[PDB]
Coordinates of C-alpha atoms in Angstrom, one line a residue:
Chain A
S1 CA 0.0 0.0 0.0
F2 CA 2.9 2.3 -0.9
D3 CA 3.2 3.9 -4.3
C4 CA 6.6 3.7 -6.0
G5 CA 8.9 6.7 -5.8
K6 CA 7.2 8.3 -2.8
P7 CA 9.3 8.4 0.4
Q8 CA 7.5 8.3 3.7
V9 CA 10.2 10.5 5.4
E10 CA 10.8 13.6 3.4
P11 CA 14.4 13.8 2.1
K12 CA 16.6 16.5 3.5
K13 CA 17.4 17.7 0.0
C14 CA 20.6 19.5 0.8
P15 CA 22.3 21.9 -1.6
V16 CA 29.5 10.0 -1.4
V17 CA 31.9 12.9 -1.3
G18 CA 30.3 16.1 0.0
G19 CA 26.5 16.3 0.3
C20 CA 25.0 15.3 3.6
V21 CA 23.7 12.4 5.7
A22 CA 20.2 11.5 4.7
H23 CA 17.2 11.4 7.0
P24 CA 16.9 7.7 7.9
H25 CA 14.5 6.0 5.5
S26 CA 14.0 8.9 3.2
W27 CA 15.4 6.9 0.3
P28 CA 13.5 3.6 0.9
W29 CA 14.5 2.0 -2.4
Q30 CA 18.2 2.2 -1.6
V31 CA 19.8 -1.3 -1.4
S32 CA 23.1 -2.4 0.1
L33 CA 24.7 -5.3 -1.8
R34 CA 26.9 -7.7 0.1
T35 CA 28.6 -11.0 -0.4
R36 CA 27.4 -14.0 1.6
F37 CA 29.7 -13.3 4.6
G38 CA 30.9 -9.8 3.5
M39 CA 30.2 -6.2 4.2
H40 CA 28.7 -3.5 2.0
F41 CA 30.5 -3.1 -1.4
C42 CA 28.0 -1.7 -3.8
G43 CA 24.5 -0.2 -3.9
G44 CA 21.3 -1.0 -5.8
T45 CA 17.8 0.2 -6.2
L46 CA 14.6 -1.8 -5.4
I47 CA 12.3 -1.5 -8.4
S48 CA 9.7 -4.1 -7.4
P49 CA 9.3 -6.5 -4.4
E50 CA 11.3 -9.2 -6.2
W51 CA 13.8 -7.1 -8.3
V52 CA 16.8 -4.9 -7.6
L53 CA 18.7 -3.0 -10.3
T54 CA 22.5 -2.5 -9.9
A55 CA 25.6 -2.1 -12.0
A56 CA 26.9 -5.1 -13.8
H57 CA 30.5 -4.6 -12.6
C58 CA 29.2 -5.1 -9.0
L59 CA 28.9 -8.8 -9.9
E60 CA 32.5 -9.2 -11.0
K61 CA 33.5 -11.2 -7.9
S62 CA 31.3 -14.2 -8.7
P63 CA 28.9 -15.3 -11.4
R64 CA 26.8 -17.3 -8.9
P65 CA 23.6 -15.7 -7.3
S66 CA 24.3 -17.5 -4.0
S67 CA 27.3 -15.3 -3.5
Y68 CA 25.1 -12.2 -3.0
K69 CA 22.6 -10.8 -0.5
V70 CA 20.7 -7.6 -0.3
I71 CA 20.0 -5.4 2.7
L72 CA 16.8 -3.3 2.5
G73 CA 15.6 -0.6 4.9
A74 CA 19.1 0.3 6.2
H75 CA 20.7 3.5 7.4
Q76 CA 24.0 2.3 8.8
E77 CA 26.6 0.8 6.6
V78 CA 27.7 -1.8 9.1
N79 CA 25.5 -1.9 12.2
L80 CA 22.2 -3.1 10.8
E81 CA 19.0 -1.9 12.5
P82 CA 16.8 -4.5 14.2
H83 CA 14.2 -4.0 11.4
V84 CA 16.2 -4.4 8.2
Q85 CA 15.4 -7.1 5.6
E86 CA 18.2 -9.3 4.4
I87 CA 17.4 -11.4 1.3
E88 CA 19.5 -13.8 -0.7
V89 CA 19.8 -13.3 -4.4
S90 CA 18.3 -16.1 -6.6
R91 CA 19.2 -15.0 -10.1
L92 CA 21.5 -12.6 -12.0
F93 CA 20.5 -11.0 -15.3
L94 CA 23.1 -8.8 -16.9
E95 CA 22.1 -6.4 -19.7
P96 CA 22.6 -8.4 -23.0
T97 CA 24.5 -5.6 -25.0
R98 CA 27.1 -5.7 -22.2
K99 CA 26.3 -2.3 -20.7
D100 CA 27.0 -1.8 -17.0
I101 CA 23.5 -2.6 -15.7
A102 CA 22.1 -5.8 -14.1
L103 CA 18.9 -7.1 -12.5
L104 CA 19.0 -9.3 -9.3
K105 CA 16.0 -11.5 -8.6
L106 CA 15.4 -11.9 -4.9
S107 CA 14.9 -15.4 -3.4
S108 CA 11.8 -14.0 -1.6
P109 CA 9.8 -10.8 -2.1
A110 CA 10.7 -7.8 -0.1
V111 CA 8.0 -6.8 2.4
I112 CA 6.9 -3.3 1.3
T113 CA 6.7 -1.0 4.3
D114 CA 7.1 2.6 5.2
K115 CA 10.9 2.0 5.1
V116 CA 11.2 -0.3 2.1
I117 CA 9.5 1.0 -1.1
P118 CA 10.5 0.6 -4.8
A119 CA 11.6 3.4 -7.0
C120 CA 9.7 4.4 -10.1
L121 CA 11.1 3.7 -13.6
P122 CA 11.1 6.3 -16.3
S123 CA 9.3 6.2 -19.6
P124 CA 11.4 4.3 -22.2
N125 CA 14.1 6.5 -23.9
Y126 CA 13.4 9.7 -21.9
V127 CA 16.4 12.1 -21.9
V128 CA 17.0 14.1 -18.7
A129 CA 17.5 17.7 -19.7
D130 CA 20.7 19.7 -19.1
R131 CA 20.9 21.3 -15.6
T132 CA 18.2 19.2 -14.0
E133 CA 18.8 18.8 -10.3
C134 CA 18.9 15.1 -9.3
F135 CA 19.9 13.2 -6.2
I136 CA 22.5 10.4 -5.7
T137 CA 22.6 8.3 -2.6
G138 CA 24.9 5.7 -1.1
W139 CA 27.3 4.4 1.6
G140 CA 30.5 5.0 -0.4
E141 CA 33.9 6.7 0.4
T142 CA 33.6 10.3 1.6
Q143 CA 37.2 11.5 0.9
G144 CA 37.4 13.2 4.3
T145 CA 33.9 14.7 4.2
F146 CA 31.5 14.1 7.1
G147 CA 29.0 11.2 7.2
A148 CA 31.2 8.1 6.8
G149 CA 29.3 4.9 7.7
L150 CA 25.8 6.5 7.2
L151 CA 23.6 6.8 4.1
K152 CA 24.5 10.0 2.4
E153 CA 22.9 12.0 -0.4
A154 CA 24.0 14.8 -2.7
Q155 CA 22.1 17.0 -5.1
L156 CA 23.9 17.3 -8.5
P157 CA 22.9 18.9 -11.8
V158 CA 22.8 16.8 -15.0
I159 CA 25.3 17.8 -17.7
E160 CA 24.2 17.0 -21.2
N161 CA 26.3 14.3 -22.9
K162 CA 27.6 16.7 -25.7
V163 CA 29.1 18.9 -23.0
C164 CA 30.4 16.2 -20.8
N165 CA 32.2 14.6 -23.8
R166 CA 34.3 17.7 -24.5
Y167 CA 38.1 17.4 -24.4
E168 CA 38.5 19.3 -21.1
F169 CA 35.8 17.2 -19.4
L170 CA 35.5 13.4 -20.2
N171 CA 36.9 13.6 -23.8
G172 CA 34.5 11.3 -25.7
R173 CA 34.2 8.6 -23.1
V174 CA 30.5 8.9 -22.4
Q175 CA 28.1 6.7 -24.3
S176 CA 24.5 7.5 -25.4
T177 CA 23.3 5.0 -22.8
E178 CA 25.1 7.0 -20.1
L179 CA 24.5 10.4 -18.5
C180 CA 26.7 12.8 -16.6
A181 CA 26.1 14.7 -13.3
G182 CA 28.1 16.9 -11.1
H183 CA 29.6 20.4 -10.5
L184 CA 32.4 21.5 -12.7
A185 CA 34.1 23.1 -9.7
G186 CA 34.2 19.6 -8.1
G187 CA 33.8 18.7 -4.5
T188 CA 30.6 16.6 -4.6
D189 CA 30.3 13.1 -6.2
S190 CA 29.5 9.5 -5.8
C191 CA 32.5 7.5 -4.9
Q192 CA 33.8 3.9 -4.2
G193 CA 31.0 1.9 -2.7
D194 CA 28.2 3.9 -4.4
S195 CA 28.3 1.9 -7.6
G196 CA 24.9 0.4 -8.5
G197 CA 23.0 2.9 -6.4
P198 CA 20.4 5.3 -7.7
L199 CA 20.4 8.7 -9.3
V200 CA 16.8 10.0 -9.0
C201 CA 15.0 13.1 -10.2
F202 CA 11.8 14.6 -8.8
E203 CA 8.9 14.9 -11.2
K204 CA 5.6 16.3 -10.0
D205 CA 5.1 14.3 -6.9
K206 CA 7.5 11.3 -6.9
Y207 CA 11.1 10.4 -7.6
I208 CA 12.0 8.7 -10.9
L209 CA 15.1 6.5 -11.2
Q210 CA 17.2 8.0 -14.1
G211 CA 20.7 6.7 -13.5
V212 CA 22.7 3.9 -12.0
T213 CA 26.0 4.9 -10.5
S214 CA 28.8 3.6 -12.7
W215 CA 32.2 5.2 -13.0
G216 CA 34.3 8.4 -13.0
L217 CA 37.7 9.8 -13.5
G218 CA 38.2 9.7 -9.8
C219 CA 35.6 11.3 -7.5
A220 CA 34.8 15.0 -7.0
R221 CA 37.6 16.2 -9.2
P222 CA 37.1 19.6 -10.9
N223 CA 35.9 19.3 -14.6
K224 CA 35.3 15.5 -14.1
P225 CA 31.6 14.7 -13.6
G226 CA 30.4 11.3 -12.5
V227 CA 28.9 8.9 -15.1
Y228 CA 25.7 6.9 -14.6
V229 CA 24.0 4.4 -16.8
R230 CA 21.0 6.0 -18.4
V231 CA 18.1 3.9 -17.0
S232 CA 15.5 5.0 -19.6
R233 CA 17.4 3.2 -22.4
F234 CA 16.9 -0.1 -20.6
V235 CA 13.3 0.1 -19.3
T236 CA 11.9 -2.1 -22.1
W237 CA 14.6 -4.7 -21.4
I238 CA 14.0 -4.5 -17.6
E239 CA 10.2 -5.0 -18.1
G240 CA 10.9 -8.0 -20.3
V241 CA 13.1 -9.7 -17.7
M242 CA 10.6 -9.2 -14.9
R243 CA 7.7 -10.4 -17.2
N244 CA 9.5 -13.6 -18.3
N245 CA 11.4 -14.6 -15.1
Chain B
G1 CA 41.9 6.7 -15.9
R2 CA 38.3 5.4 -15.6
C3 CA 37.5 3.8 -12.3
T4 CA 34.3 2.2 -11.3
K5 CA 32.7 3.2 -8.0
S6 CA 32.7 -0.3 -6.5
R7 CA 34.6 -1.4 -3.4
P8 CA 37.3 -2.1 -4.6
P9 CA 37.3 0.0 -7.7
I10 CA 37.9 -1.5 -11.2
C11 CA 40.3 0.7 -13.0
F12 CA 41.5 1.2 -16.6
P13 CA 44.7 2.6 -18.1
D14 CA 42.8 5.7 -19.4

């Protein structure tokens, strides 16, 4: 009884390196991906009770679903609250054109609560406009900024691909199935441990998943925005996997 | 110079 994309605790939305610590449970689709006996190493986004979207490179350690588990409803990176859901992964579906996106099927459906709610997917092939303010979240490296060990958020503007691909920026590296976000001055960015997590943009009354954290030329460097897989180019594929599996 | 944002990062010569 919770609509996708609508947090039950309002996000702080403060103007992960930089940014701020999120209000607990204000990003209820945020997933922590772990190995069977391991700690957090990547993020993900709950997109339905049985399905988590992440980056394909987060599965490089093992091709077997039994190697992975997801933590839902968390705020701490290490000290799990006495209400979080821990669910083993049952299947791995990597994007077939070899782009950096993958679906995890959960061994049992997540219980949807005020703290665990799926994100909404965009319309197929939607292109986020230049300068749109979006939010990235995760438990990654902070490079000396406050908030290590807690779920962090940062608000970053999207940079259109034609700009991001200029020589002084990312010099032709960014593909049409990727998008860029960040401040050219640097200082605020997703970082190691944030891969696979969400980039969301607010539209009307809910948050829409537009990016999956993927790579960068470092983190938070001036003139080097972060790169995210463009979710809208994969919605049709995602829908097909869920429908057929 | 590309590095993924996983722990640990996967890095490339560029």
